[PDB]
Ligand binder design. Sequence first.
Ligand code: HEC
Length: 104
Amino acid sequence: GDVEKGKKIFVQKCAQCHTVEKGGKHKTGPNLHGLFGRKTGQAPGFTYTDANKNKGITWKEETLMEYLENPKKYIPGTKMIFAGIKKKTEREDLIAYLKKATNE
Ligand code: HEC
């Protein structure tokens, strides 16, 4: 996945919702500053969802891959904003940024 496209994709998809970096605040999306290497239904002092805890997985591309292109599949009680990312290609690029970004 391209980190460069990934960066822009994140900014062109999520941006005013997630941060994936330090000091990302707590608007709607949790500041995803440690996605790749944590379990679900947990966050540093942030209002989480039950449905996420109900997932009980490890975030590692392979998992988010469905979530970003199937927000009403894993569990029918998310936020359901749209279909999903454009396709797997974009998803991959997105992840490529994310892998770094979340871990700085
Ligand atoms: C707000 C308008 C959001 C947009 C746009 C995107 N996301 Fe999101 N995301 C949001 C919330 C409130 C949450 C928590 C829901 C939950 O499952 O408890 C999330 C969660 C994620 C996760 C899982 C991390 C976790 O909370 O356990 C991932 C991997 C994620 N979001 C990725 C993601 C990406 C890459 C987006 C743009 C392509 C995106 N989200 C948009 C809120 C919002």
